Design an enzyme around this catalytic site. Structure first.
Site, PDB file in Angstrom:
ATOM      1  N   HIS A   1      79.600 -26.516 107.946  1.00 39.46           N
ATOM      2  CA  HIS A   1      79.643 -27.884 108.200  1.00 39.46           C
ATOM      3  C   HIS A   1      79.816 -27.804 110.354  1.00 39.46           C
ATOM      4  O   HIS A   1      80.734 -28.955 110.685  1.00 39.46           O
ATOM      5  CB  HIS A   1      80.972 -27.575 108.342  1.00 39.46           C
ATOM      6  CG  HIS A   1      82.935 -27.042 109.047  1.00 39.46           C
ATOM      7  ND1 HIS A   1      82.718 -26.959 109.891  1.00 39.46           N
ATOM      8  CD2 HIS A   1      83.601 -25.960 108.679  1.00 39.46           C
ATOM      9  CE1 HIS A   1      83.603 -26.211 110.641  1.00 39.46           C
ATOM     10  NE2 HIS A   1      83.764 -25.130 109.836  1.00 39.46           N
TER      11      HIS A   1
ATOM     12  N   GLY B   1      87.580 -24.978 117.530  1.00 42.03           N
ATOM     13  CA  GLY B   1      86.611 -24.839 117.749  1.00 42.03           C
ATOM     14  C   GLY B   1      86.507 -23.671 117.716  1.00 42.03           C
ATOM     15  O   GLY B   1      84.636 -23.328 118.367  1.00 42.03           O
TER      16      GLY B   1
ATOM     17  N   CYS C   1      85.591 -21.699 114.738  1.00 41.89           N
ATOM     18  CA  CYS C   1      84.781 -21.774 113.734  1.00 41.89           C
ATOM     19  C   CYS C   1      83.716 -20.511 114.118  1.00 41.89           C
ATOM     20  O   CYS C   1      83.343 -21.140 115.206  1.00 41.89           O
ATOM     21  CB  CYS C   1      84.358 -23.019 113.014  1.00 41.89           C
ATOM     22  SG  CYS C   1      86.110 -23.297 112.228  1.00 41.89           S
TER      23      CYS C   1
HETATM   24  C1  H6L Z   1      86.214 -25.175 113.421  1.00 41.29           C
HETATM   25  O1  H6L Z   1      86.517 -24.856 114.340  1.00 41.29           O
HETATM   26  C2  H6L Z   1      87.647 -25.621 112.723  1.00 41.29           C
HETATM   27  C3  H6L Z   1      88.991 -24.853 112.867  1.00 41.29           C
HETATM   28  C4  H6L Z   1      90.336 -25.107 112.751  1.00 41.29           C
HETATM   29  C5  H6L Z   1      90.487 -26.663 113.123  1.00 41.29           C
HETATM   30  C6  H6L Z   1      91.880 -27.005 113.305  1.00 41.29           C
HETATM   31  C7  H6L Z   1      92.964 -25.360 114.211  1.00 41.29           C
HETATM   32  N1  H6L Z   1      93.174 -24.279 113.523  1.00 41.29           N
HETATM   33  C8  H6L Z   1      91.402 -24.049 111.945  1.00 41.29           C
HETATM   34  O2  H6L Z   1      90.917 -23.112 112.157  1.00 41.29           O
HETATM   35  N2  H6L Z   1      87.857 -25.668 110.909  1.00 41.29           N
HETATM   36  C9  H6L Z   1      87.609 -27.572 110.717  1.00 41.29           C
HETATM   37  O3  H6L Z   1      87.954 -27.882 111.252  1.00 41.29           O
HETATM   38  C10 H6L Z   1      88.102 -27.528 109.009  1.00 41.29           C
HETATM   39  C11 H6L Z   1      86.222 -27.935 108.848  1.00 41.29           C
HETATM   40  C12 H6L Z   1      86.585 -28.353 107.098  1.00 41.29           C
HETATM   41  C13 H6L Z   1      86.555 -26.986 105.917  1.00 41.29           C
HETATM   42  C14 H6L Z   1      84.752 -29.290 106.724  1.00 41.29           C
HETATM   43  N3  H6L Z   1      88.767 -28.279 108.879  1.00 41.29           N
HETATM   44  C15 H6L Z   1      90.106 -27.903 108.520  1.00 41.29           C
HETATM   45  O4  H6L Z   1      89.992 -26.491 109.232  1.00 41.29           O
HETATM   46  C16 H6L Z   1      91.197 -28.797 107.993  1.00 41.29           C
HETATM   47  N4  H6L Z   1      91.692 -28.590 106.862  1.00 41.29           N
HETATM   48  C17 H6L Z   1      92.020 -28.986 106.061  1.00 41.29           C
HETATM   49  O5  H6L Z   1      91.717 -29.453 106.000  1.00 41.29           O
HETATM   50  C18 H6L Z   1      92.503 -27.935 104.414  1.00 41.29           C
HETATM   51  C19 H6L Z   1      92.883 -28.728 103.424  1.00 41.29           C
HETATM   52  C20 H6L Z   1      93.310 -28.147 102.774  1.00 41.29           C
HETATM   53  C21 H6L Z   1      92.657 -26.471 102.019  1.00 41.29           C
HETATM   54  N5  H6L Z   1      92.980 -26.251 101.024  1.00 41.29           N
HETATM   55  O6  H6L Z   1      91.989 -25.219 100.966  1.00 41.29           O
HETATM   56  O7  H6L Z   1      94.096 -26.698  99.936  1.00 41.29           O
HETATM   57  C22 H6L Z   1      91.544 -26.363 103.390  1.00 41.29           C
HETATM   58  C23 H6L Z   1      91.649 -27.327 104.445  1.00 41.29           C
HETATM   59  C24 H6L Z   1      92.504 -28.728 110.065  1.00 41.29           C
HETATM   60  C25 H6L Z   1      93.175 -29.495 109.292  1.00 41.29           C
HETATM   61  C26 H6L Z   1      91.478 -28.902 110.462  1.00 41.29           C
END
Ligand code: H6L
Ligand code: H6L
EC number: 3.4.19.12
Lengths: 306, 306
Positions: free
Chosen positions: B41, B143, B145
């Protein structure tokens, strides 16, 4: 989000650890530039650790009585001296992996990472606090002596602790890197008990701020307290008195969360007097006191080093 | 003596961390030999994370759309491919600091160290457990990830986790290093049902064995239990049911202490039914479940404090 007991990345210190052997005793040493630092009791014998005359024993030791092994490289000792409770072994070669570094003596209540080593090989890293009674609740077995504690600031390693001994209560004591013990301890296998330990109040408050930052807010109430009334309650639960300097150090966390320090004190007072009602804070049923305010700000903002 | 949540020394992994930027998105990459591994991603923009077609986004990218930085050194990408949820960026330079390594997929209940990183630089290291529902309870900010989890056996790093996302409950999810998610999760911002998070019983038992090895027996008793009678109490208290497979894994700790596995189960059952009554075990008022049987044997003395 999330809050973990986090240690500093240990790579800079890993490159500094060596094995030091004298007679049948082996422990760890710290190799910086062309000097290896290690606990002086490496020169004792089983028959002598009751009250060793360290100055006398060192007289009968030559450079070649000290075997220093840095991984696959044996280092030649070309000089030795004793500074308080640490030996300084001058060696043939400057450590090419020497980081930018300082020797610091830390205050009780401050935290540091420990790189636990055996036979000069690092085996684990964990975060520790210097207790009010100048002990640390470490995890150290036979052969761990000479393992070091440290902080990192940007790219500079501040070495603050070298491990020497275990107390009968199972906690640990050591020196700064100039060989001066923390607390009233001495490097002899005698009868030594540490003062009564207390809870580091400013750190507990810092950790309650960490909890709020990470969404865990149930303990906030609408009560108020003065500093004196908080300290009257806290002292009865074996907490350290909270000073005005402590309140100032909590300023940044207070500004970030919008919670006044004395309002956080009021929440902590209710937790002490009523208990947790079966609840946890950041997964803990005991209040954590080994995060400083600086630890909380650093972790919650993603401060980086190397 | 002592028992600490100990991470592996992070130096071997620190030498592998790089920064990867695509468009305005930056995260961490893992540089091993001439390949940089990172979450796919990185190729997303904020507006298309609800239902990204990753093979829609990737065909639109060229090698030079990926900026890979190691220190102050740009690495030139000369190829790229997607494997499951990870991107593999072939670069023109093999990492001179590549350790001996393996990619392993771990099981729920197993533990690993996490080197939390931002912009390719390490922030800290801590020990995690894969929860029974395949999430982890980490400390990950924007950041982070591409940060990895790992174990080290002798000098071989086994990478088992790469960080991708935070769930709405504040827990964390990611993949193995072949890009396969742990758990029924996908890298998109949609609600995805997670299993319920139970306490890792076999790890609690391992930690009670650790407490015995370190000299504490106050919680033992004379009862034994059957596996099924234990599991009835386990589910009342949200503990994972114990299997014969789990009992087999506790064999070495059982032999070292002389306490049969089902006798330790009877001890755990009484702790759950009666609580601690103000006492602690290894300093904890809650029973710890983030130490595997292997973790205990690695940290504890081979000599029980009888
Ligand atoms: C990468 O750096 C980043 C790390 C996140 C950032 C927020 C704070 N803590 C972390 O671990 N990853 C992302 O930004 C990631 C990218 C997506 C997966 C394409 N998005 C998220 O982590 C968001 N997660 C969701 O929106 C989410 C909703 C539902 C589910 N689920 O399984 O039910 C999973 C993920 C955060 C809200 C930013
Ligand atoms: C160095 O490697 C080693 C580490 C110790 C070893 C025991 C297990 N855990 C550790 O951290 N340090 C020593 O062996 C040290 C050598 C001395 C300082 C010359 N000895 C100890 O740590 C011993 N502790 C005491 O001897 C002691 C005993 C009683 C009392 N008391 O109040 O009665 C105080 C201190 C160990 C028991 C070997």
């Amino acid at each position: 989000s999330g809050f973990r007991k986090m240690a500093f990345p240990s790579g800079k210190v890993e490159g500094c650890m060596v094995q030091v052997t004298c007679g049948t005793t082996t422990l760890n040493g710290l190799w910086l530039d062309d000097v290896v630092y290690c606990p002086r009791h490496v020169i004792c014998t089983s028959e002598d650790m009751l009250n060793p005359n360290y100055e006398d024993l060192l007289i009968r030791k030559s450079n070649h009585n000290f075997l220093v092994q840095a991984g696959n490289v044996q280092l030649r000792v070309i000089g030795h001296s004793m500074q308080n409770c640490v030996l300084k072994l001058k060696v043939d070669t400057a450590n090419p992996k020497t980081p930018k570094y300082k020797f610091v003596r830390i205050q009780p209540g401050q935290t540091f990472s420990v790189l636990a080593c055996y036979n000069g090989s690092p085996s684990g890293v964990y975060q520790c606090a210097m207790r009010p009674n100048f002990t640390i609740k470490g995890s150290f077995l036979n052969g761990s002596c000479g393992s070091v504690g440290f902080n990192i600031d940007y790219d500079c390693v501040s070495f603050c602790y070298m491990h020497h001994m275990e107390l009968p209560t199972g906690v640990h004591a050591g020196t700064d890197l100039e060989g001066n013990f923390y607390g009233p301890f001495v490097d002899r296998q005698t009868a030594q008990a540490a003062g009564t330990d207390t809870t580091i109040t400013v750190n507990v408050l810092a950790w309650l701020y960490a909890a709020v930052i990470n969404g865990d807010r149930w303990f906030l109430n609408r009560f108020t307290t003065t500093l004196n009334d908080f300290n009257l309650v806290a002292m009865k639960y074996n907490y350290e008195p909270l000073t005005q300097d402590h309140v100032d150090i909590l300023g940044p966390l207070s500004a970030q969360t919008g919670i006044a320090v004395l309002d956080m004190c009021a929440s902590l007072k209710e937790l002490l007097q009523n208990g947790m009602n079966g609840r946890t804070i950041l997964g803990s049923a005991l209040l954590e006191d080994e995060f400083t305010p600086f630890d909380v700000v650093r972790q919650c903002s993603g401060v980086t080093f190397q």
